[PDB]
Design an enzyme around this catalytic site. Structure first.
Site, short mmCIF file in Angstrom:
data_model
loop_
_atom_site.label_atom_id
_atom_site.label_comp_id
_atom_site.label_asym_id
_atom_site.label_seq_id
_atom_site.Cartn_x
_atom_site.Cartn_y
_atom_site.Cartn_z
N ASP A 22 0.87 -1.16 0.00
CA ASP A 22 0.00 0.00 0.00
C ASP A 22 0.91 1.22 0.00
O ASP A 22 1.50 1.56 1.04
CB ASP A 22 -0.94 -0.02 1.21
CG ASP A 22 -1.82 1.22 1.30
OD1 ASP A 22 -1.48 2.28 0.72
OD2 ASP A 22 -2.86 1.12 1.97
N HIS A 137 -4.96 12.78 13.52
CA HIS A 137 -5.99 12.58 12.51
C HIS A 137 -7.18 11.78 13.02
O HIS A 137 -8.25 11.81 12.39
CB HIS A 137 -5.42 11.87 11.28
CG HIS A 137 -4.35 12.66 10.59
ND1 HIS A 137 -4.44 14.03 10.42
CD2 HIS A 137 -3.16 12.29 10.07
CE1 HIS A 137 -3.35 14.46 9.80
NE2 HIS A 137 -2.55 13.42 9.59
N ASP A 174 2.89 19.53 13.23
CA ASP A 174 2.94 18.55 12.16
C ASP A 174 2.65 19.23 10.81
O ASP A 174 2.03 20.30 10.75
CB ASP A 174 1.92 17.45 12.45
CG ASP A 174 2.09 16.23 11.56
OD1 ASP A 174 2.72 15.25 12.01
OD2 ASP A 174 1.60 16.25 10.41
N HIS A 176 0.71 18.05 8.51
CA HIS A 176 -0.66 17.75 8.15
C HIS A 176 -1.61 18.40 9.16
O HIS A 176 -1.22 18.69 10.29
CB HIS A 176 -0.89 16.25 8.10
CG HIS A 176 -0.04 15.53 7.10
ND1 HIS A 176 1.12 14.87 7.44
CD2 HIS A 176 -0.20 15.33 5.77
CE1 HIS A 176 1.64 14.30 6.37
NE2 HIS A 176 0.86 14.56 5.34
N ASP A 267 7.42 15.76 10.21
CA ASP A 267 7.31 15.81 8.76
C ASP A 267 7.23 17.22 8.21
O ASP A 267 7.13 17.37 7.00
CB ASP A 267 6.09 15.01 8.29
CG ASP A 267 4.82 15.34 9.05
OD1 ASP A 267 4.78 16.31 9.86
OD2 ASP A 267 3.84 14.59 8.82
N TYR A 307 9.09 11.19 8.67
CA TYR A 307 9.33 10.02 7.83
C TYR A 307 10.70 9.96 7.19
O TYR A 307 11.03 8.93 6.60
CB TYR A 307 8.28 9.94 6.72
CG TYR A 307 6.93 9.98 7.34
CD1 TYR A 307 6.42 8.84 7.94
CD2 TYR A 307 6.21 11.16 7.41
CE1 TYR A 307 5.20 8.87 8.56
CE2 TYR A 307 4.99 11.20 8.01
CZ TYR A 307 4.48 10.05 8.59
OH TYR A 307 3.25 10.07 9.21
C1 LIG Z 1 2.24 11.03 -0.92
N1 LIG Z 1 2.91 9.72 -0.48
C2 LIG Z 1 3.75 9.17 -1.62
C3 LIG Z 1 1.92 8.64 -0.03
C4 LIG Z 1 0.67 9.04 0.79
C5 LIG Z 1 0.51 8.88 2.14
N2 LIG Z 1 -0.78 9.35 2.60
C6 LIG Z 1 -1.35 9.31 3.94
C7 LIG Z 1 -0.69 10.03 5.12
C8 LIG Z 1 -1.41 10.29 6.30
C9 LIG Z 1 -0.86 10.92 7.40
C10 LIG Z 1 0.45 11.36 7.47
C11 LIG Z 1 1.06 12.14 8.69
O1 LIG Z 1 2.21 12.15 8.94
N3 LIG Z 1 0.18 12.99 9.49
O2 LIG Z 1 0.50 13.76 10.53
C12 LIG Z 1 1.21 11.12 6.26
C13 LIG Z 1 0.65 10.47 5.14
C14 LIG Z 1 -1.46 9.82 1.40
C15 LIG Z 1 -2.72 10.37 1.21
C16 LIG Z 1 -3.17 10.76 -0.03
C17 LIG Z 1 -2.33 10.61 -1.16
C18 LIG Z 1 -1.09 10.06 -0.97
C19 LIG Z 1 -0.55 9.63 0.25
K LIG Z 2 -0.43 20.60 11.87
ZN LIG Z 3 1.93 14.55 9.46
#
Ligand SMILES: CN(C)Cc1cn(Cc2ccc(C(=O)NO)cc2)c2ccccc12
Ligand SMILES: [K+]
Ligand SMILES: [Zn+2]
Ligand SMILES: [K+]
EC number: 3.5.1.48
Length: 638
Positions: A22, A137, A174, A176, A267, A307
């Site tokens: 995945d 999340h 973070d 995100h 990240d 990461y």
């Molecule tokens: C972009 N990559 C090549 C792959 C990829 C990982 N994810 C999920 C994800 C969720 C959470 C966090 C985190 O670190 N949060 O704090 C980091 C990643 C995606 C979602 C949509 C499209 C692609 C991807």
């Molecule tokens: K944040």
């Molecule tokens: Zn993140």
């Protein structure tokens, strides 16, 4: 009275992993935990921390933030084979399950509660939990983005229930958006959530309209949610600091939280394959440091993302270093935030202006990526030396000392004969200044110091001149008093901040003179100038030494400890303070902040005078073309 920093970790949380292919979930590996803990051991940082064991969060505790239905469903995943775990994971977005993830999720949550209890019971000053899986999340009835339960949301709900806190600040740095956290406290004015995050006009995951700057909370909670979307990648130290000086800190110090919890996802650091930003690991030392004077230092850092294993290790050490009080590294190259960042910043400030004082004047209109390895950070053998007037034994905090060698005394004579003549006890003051300065600059044995002096002009000259000769390429001078000093700001090696009573129009761009009206409003006005003018200039200036100077006259200084603490983010903490006259209160407060102690909160402050905010914006207009880190709006193009 609290002391020490907690480090909560357990290798059990590295014992679940992705079991099918995945490409979205591949990045979230056990080694993130392994690498971060091993980086902390290698640098002797773990060993300096109080290890607090993890525990499982109880069912009652999980139900503070999650629904029985969802907990019941997660509770059946330990009995699932991999086909069933794939099917169950597919019910959610960007998450994988594993026979041991429920177990580790309960540990990641319990770890956070352990951290909250240690801090709130005063067993430690602050701390950090290295946990997997992440939390921010996670939502009331769903797993999302590698998160199973919302560790940081838990921590605030738990702190509310068991300590009856009325005000909790959560800072989510973070890369995100922690939408689980936003949903959970949308209507709750007792939790302030700040989050910056890669957004790219809603094209970046999780792709949410309400991750934008216009989501300020709902109902009684309007104004206690703050989103700062990043709409381009490659954001830098200057963007992050501009976010803190012009959005987060002005709100956080007015909010006056009783506890601070950090969603500490790294990240957002250079090299991360998901954030794709450009801030150095060193920036986290300052993100941590700028928040530490809130809530008397009660700060719970909780790991989220990260990461790039190399980037990850170095940002975790930079954070723990600052939790332990080690001197902050110098950030060079700071300037204006980029245009997209200034757009985001001004939009958040404008939409938040309905709710927060510091922004209120905006509403009326009458007003493989590689980078240099971070340098070693190391606590000074004695952090603070103090020179009270002759014959004043004083109760010194744990890491302090009192006062002259022949070398030194030879130098005071040379200086006496050439530039002064004088015959006094000042000769002692100047021998002290020099011997203290030499210990600060020459040895990593002493970090900062305070000297009580009598004659101001001679003291200032020898301090400043001896500093430029060591050599200290640049010196920031912070002077609370009236008049002019033996300080020349014409060669670009000195920047002068002056807090005074008489309003004197200054011309050139190496001086910032602040004259605030007398009265009860003066405390709020000083904190606004500190966060929104003084700190941004000082960080861009990047001095090698800070020289603080206080006239005997001014009395109204419930703020001195906050500045002393924040101002140690510059010059690796190397600050020499000259106190003119004796005042046991001011001297004990200065030494306490210098020594790294806790600073007492400011609490409620009468919002500042419009005449004060107007004078400050006149200074920003006047200085921001030279000092771009002062900008909090997009600049006009010709
Ligand atoms: C972009 N990559 C090549 C792959 C990829 C990982 N994810 C999920 C994800 C969720 C959470 C966090 C985190 O670190 N949060 O704090 C980091 C990643 C995606 C979602 C949509 C499209 C692609 C991807
Ligand atoms: K944040
Ligand atoms: Zn993140
Ligand atoms: K809220």
């Amino acid at each position: 009275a609290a002391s020490g920093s907690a480090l909560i970790f357990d290798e059990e949380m590295s014992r679940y992993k992705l079991l099918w292919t995945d490409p979205e979930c591949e990045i979230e590996v056990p080694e993130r935990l392994t690498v971060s803990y091993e980086a902390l051991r290698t640098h002797g940082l773990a060993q300096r921390c109080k290890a607090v064991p993890v525990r499982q969060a109880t069912e009652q505790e999980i139900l503070l933030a999650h629904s029985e239905e969802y907990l019941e469903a997660v509770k059946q995943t330990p009995g699932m084979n991999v086909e069933e775990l794939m099917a169950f994971s597919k019910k959610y977005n960007a998450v994988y399950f594993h026979q041991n993830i429920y177990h580790c999720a309960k540990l990641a949550a319990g770890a956070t509660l352990q951290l909250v209890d240690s801090v709130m019971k005063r067993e430690v000053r602050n701390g950090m939990a290295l946990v997997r899986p992440p939390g921010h999340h996670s939502q009331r009835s769903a797993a999302n983005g590698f998160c199973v339960f919302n560790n940081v949301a838990f921590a605030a709900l738990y702190a509310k229930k068991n300590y009856n806190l009325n005000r909790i600040l959560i800072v989510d740095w973070d890369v995100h958006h922690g939408q689980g956290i936003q949903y959970c406290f949308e209507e709750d004015p007792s939790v302030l959530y700040f989050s910056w995050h890669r957004y790219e006009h809603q094209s970046f995951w999780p792709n949410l309209p309400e991750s934008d700057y216009s989501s300020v909370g709902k109902g009684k909670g309007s104004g206690f949610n703050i989103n700062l979307p990043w709409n381009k990648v490659g954001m830098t130290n200057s963007d992050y600091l501009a976010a803190f000086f012009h959005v987060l800190l002005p709100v956080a110090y007015e909010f006056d939280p009783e506890l601070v919890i950090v969603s500490a996802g790294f990240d957002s650091a250079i090299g991360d394959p998901e954030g794709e930003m450009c801030a150095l690991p060193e920036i986290f030392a300052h993100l941590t440091h700028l928040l530490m004077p809130l809530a008397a230092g009660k700060m719970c850092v909780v790991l989220e993302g990260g990461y790039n294993l190399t980037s990850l290790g170095q940002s975790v050490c930079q954070t723990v270093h600052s939790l332990l009080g080690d001197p902050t590294p110098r950030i060079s190259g700071l300037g204006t935030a980029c245009d997209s960042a200034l757009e985001s910043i001004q939009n958040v400030r404008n939409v938040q202006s309905s709710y927060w004082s510091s922004f209120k004047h905006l509403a009326q209109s009458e007003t493989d990526i590689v980078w240099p390895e971070p340098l070693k950070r190391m606590p000074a053998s004695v952090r603070t030396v103090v020179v009270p007037p002759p014959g004043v034994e004083l109760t010194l905090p744990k890491n302090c000392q009192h006062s002259i060698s022949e070398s030194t005394a030879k130098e005071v004579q040379r200086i006496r004969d050439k530039h002064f003549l004088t015959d006094q006890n000042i000769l002692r003051s100047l021998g002290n200044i020099i011997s203290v300065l030499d210990r600060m600059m020459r040895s990593d044995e002493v970090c900062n110091g305070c000297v009580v002096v009598s004659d101001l002009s001679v003291s200032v000259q020898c301090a400043l001149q001896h500093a430029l000769t060591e050599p200290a390429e640049r010196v920031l001078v912070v002077y609370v008093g009236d008049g002019e000093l033996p300080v020349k700001t014409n060669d670009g090696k000195v920047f002068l901040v002056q807090i005074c009573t008489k309003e004197t129009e200054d011309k050139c761009v190496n001086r910032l003179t602040l004259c605030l009206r007398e009265g009860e409003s003066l405390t709020a006005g000083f904190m606004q100038a500190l966060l929104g003018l003084i700190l941004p200039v000082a960080y861009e200036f990047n001095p090698a030494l800070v020289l603080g100077i206080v006239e005997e006259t001014a009395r109204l200084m419930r703020v001195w400890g906050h500045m002393t603490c924040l101002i140690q983010g510059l010059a690796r903490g190397r600050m020499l303070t000259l106190l003119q006259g004796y005042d046991k209160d001011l001297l004990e407060l200065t030494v306490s902040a210098l020594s790294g102690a806790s600073i007492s909160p400011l609490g409620p402050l009468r919002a500042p005078k419009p005449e004060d905010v107007e004078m400050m914006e006149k200074q920003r207009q006047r200085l921001q073309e030279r000092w771009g880190l002062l900008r909090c709006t997009v600049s006009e193009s010709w």
